[PDB]
Amino acid sequence: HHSSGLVPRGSHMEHAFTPLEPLLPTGNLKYCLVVLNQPLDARFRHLWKKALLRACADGGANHLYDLTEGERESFLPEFVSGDFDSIRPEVKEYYTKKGCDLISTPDQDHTDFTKCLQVLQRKIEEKELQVDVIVTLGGLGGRFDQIMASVNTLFQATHITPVPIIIIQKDSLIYLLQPGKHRLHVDTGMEGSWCGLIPVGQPCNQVTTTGLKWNLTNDVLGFGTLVSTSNTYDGSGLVTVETDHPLLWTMAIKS
């Protein structure tokens, strides 16, 4: 203001995110990996390799243990948290003898996924390291109530860690967009054909987007009113979203 010479004016911060980047072979993101109790998709090995930290939520360990025979010492979690109402005795044993940190989380008011994030967040600050994103595998298939629980974890996550969290399983990815403006880069080449915007918690009364086939212009998104599913990209390679309330972004993963 009071300075002289050219001076940038106008400007509002925007959240610039690239969803499926962790799925890119090369690149150097810096992310943590969380394995939930669900069948592991083949992309897990590559994701594990470059992850800064890996962990498993209860049953998640069973799935990891069973899909890494002959090379399990190459897939040793930094820690396995949960309540152990899912991990098999022998699996709990193996990881404990190899040095894995087994953390018990009894709380019956919260899922192991949520509790696992709490442990992860703590290990993050406690190890003075920071991540650009937390990649969660599984949680979108199987039991319906659990799928919803996963979505609800993304809500609580805002109070657990400042690091963005994405959930991936089979051909889907979800990411909760907090109120404000977002710039999502969907030009990694790993993108599928569909995408969508789900009002999960409450109606989003003012949504505006760009880069979609069916864009919103200060529109209302709400169950029973209008939910964007089976939407697609305009080809620009960029999607911007502005929402007044938490809005769930979902997109397809190639192949």
Ligand X SMILES: Nc1ncnc2c1ncn2[C@@H]1O[C@H](COP(=O)(O)O)[C@@H](O)[C@H]1O
Q: Which residues bind a second copy (CB under 8 A)?
A: 111, 140-149, 151-152, 155-156, 158, 170-174, 194-196, 198-203, 222-224, 227, 229-231, 246, 250, 252
Residues 6+ apart with CB under 8 A from 16: 183, 185
CB 139, CB 179: distance < 8 Å: no
What is the rounded radius of gyration, in angstroms, for the C-alpha atoms of the chain? 20
Site for ligand PYI in 133-172 (CB under 6 A): 146
Q: Which of 147, 220, 226, 252 binds ligand X (CB under 6 A)?
A: 147
3-state secondary structure of 10: coil
Q: How far is the CB of 190 from Mg ion (least distance, A)?
A: 24
Q: Which of 15, 41, 76, 86 binds Mg ion (CB under 5 A)?
A: 86
Q: How far is the CB of 186 from ligand PYI (least distance, A)?
A: 15
**Residue 102 sits in the site that holds ligand X (CB under 6 A):** no
Q: Which of 21, 41, 83, 187 binds Mg ion (CB under 5 A)?
A: 83
Quote the CA–CA distance of 27 and 22 in Å, as a whole number. Answer: 8
The helix (run of H) or strand (run of E) holding residue 121 is helix 112-126
Chosen from ligand X, ligand PYI, a second copy, none, partner binding at 174 (C-beta under 5 to 8 Å by type): a second copy
Using alpha carbons only, give the angle 114, 111, 199 rounded to the nearest 5 degrees.
70
Quote the CA–CA distance of 38 and 141 in Å, as a whole number. Answer: 8
Count of beta carbons in the 10 Å neighbourhood of residue 78: 18
Q: Which stretch binds ligand PYI (CB under 6 A): 26-34, 103-111, 172-180, 245-253?
A: 103-111
**Residue 141 sits in the site that holds ligand X (CB under 6 A):** yes
The values of phi and psi at residue 17, to 5°, are -125, 150
**Residue 34 sits in the site that holds ligand X (CB under 6 A):** no
Distances (CA, A) of 2 to 41, 66, 112, 228: 57, 65, 53, 46
**Residue 58 sits in the site that holds Mg ion (CB under 5 A):** yes
Between residues 178 and 229, which has the closer beta carbon with respect to ligand PYI?
229
Q: Which of 34, 51, 53, 57 binds ligand X (CB under 6 A)?
A: 57
How many residues bind Mg ion (CB under 5 A)? The answer is: 5
Residue ranges that bind Mg ion, judged by CB under 5 A: 58, 83, 85-86, 112
